[PDB]
């Protein structure tokens, strides 16, 4: 035994299934019609909604 001890610290990551409660009309969500924008590239054309 050397002249000094030591305290070790450790972390373990657990996997968990949560449950969430919410009250009726706790929030109101505001949305519009989805909107599409075009990125033009020759071989493949992409559209962002």
């Amino acid at each position: 035994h050397p002249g000094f001890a030591l305290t070790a610290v450790r972390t373990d990551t657990f996997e968990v299934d949560m449950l969430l409660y919410s009250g009726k009309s706790c929030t109101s969500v505001i949305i519009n019609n989805p909107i599409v924008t075009k990125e033009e590239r020759d071989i493949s054309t992409t559209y962002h909604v």
Binding site: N33, P34, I35, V36, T37, K38, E39, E40, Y47, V49
Partner: protein
């Protein structure tokens, strides 16, 4: 191959139904998506998306910054993207006041590390920097996205507004009295071969001179001291092999009335800029002169 067929005027989107409209109308089907007008579907500018860490995003939330990609001798982050401002702290031209200002702003691991990677390598700057376009977006985060264009104007998604190009004043350079109806904007880097650390000077030029030969002759006439020092270091400190007293890169065309002097604010710090309110990008790689 007929009289009626050849006489036809070309087909244009505002009157011809968009492709998704064609498909849905032909099936007689509906989507929840509102898809009649496609945004970005009439843009002439060619854009790209870049990711950068938060430390380098200073002074970049303002559209109109000029963006640079620089080489690093490492492997996994090997290319970082830096702004012309961060390039200014190293510029041995810019005055002490502006230098201390943007040194006070650019205080993070990422930007400072960009500075050591610039100061470390034996290569000259122009053999380490590749130029990108001018930026117009900001999407914040620990790693942020920037949208950059290098061919054309610089404007909002609806083209509701045009974003200027912003130059820091101590880099702004002029060589002519009577302003031309059209002027090009060039980037110039020049090297001081005096002292142990060859001090690089950074310029953004504006001139009506389109031709390469007369432009380079005027530049060499105005940069006499650096050429003298190039020949001097050739003579006095041999078997070190300098090349280039400077390089010139072309990106832009603006009308003289569009350019104005302006201020720039960030974190209530006050930086002075020269602005080109309407501006278009056309990038060409460097050319070297001695």
């Amino acid at each position: 191959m007929d009289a009626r067929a050849v006489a036809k005027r070309p087909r244009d989107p505002a009157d011809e139904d968009n492709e998704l409209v064609t498909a849905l109308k032909a099936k007689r089907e509906v989507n929840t998506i509102s898809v009649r007008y496609l945004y970005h579907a009439d843009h002439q500018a060619l854009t790209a998306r870049f990711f950068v860490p938060e430390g380098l995003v200073e002074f970049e939330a303002q559209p109109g910054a000029l963006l640079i990609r620089m080489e690093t001798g490492c492997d996994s982050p090997r290319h970082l993207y830096i702004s012309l401002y961060l390039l200014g702290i190293r510029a041995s031209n810019v005055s002490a006041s502006t230098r201390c200002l943007l040194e006070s702003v650019y205080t993070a691991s990422a930007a400072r590390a960009a500075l050591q990677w610039l100061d470390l390598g034996p290569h000259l700057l122009h053999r380490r920097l590749e130029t990108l376009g001018c930026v117009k977006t900001v999407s914040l985060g620990i790693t942020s996205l920037l949208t950059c264009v290098m061919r054309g104007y610089l404007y909002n998604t609806l083209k509701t507004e045009v974003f200027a190009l912003m130059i820091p004043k101590d880099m702004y350079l002029t060589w002519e009295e009577t302003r031309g109806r059209l002027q090009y904007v060039y980037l110039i880097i020049v090297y001081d071969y005096d002292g142990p650390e060859t001090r690089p000077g950074i310029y953004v030029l504006t001139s009506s001179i389109a031709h390469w030969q007369t432009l380079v002759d005027v530049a060499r006439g105005k940069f006499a001291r650096e050429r003298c020092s190039f020949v001097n270091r050739r003579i006095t400190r041999p078997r070190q092999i300098p090349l280039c007293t400077g390089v010139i890169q072309k990106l832009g065309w603006c009308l003289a009335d569009d350019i104005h002097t302006s201020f720039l604010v960030h974190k209530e710090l006050k930086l002075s800029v020269v602005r080109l309110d309407n501006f278009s990008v056309e990038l060409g790689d460097f050319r070297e002169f001695v």
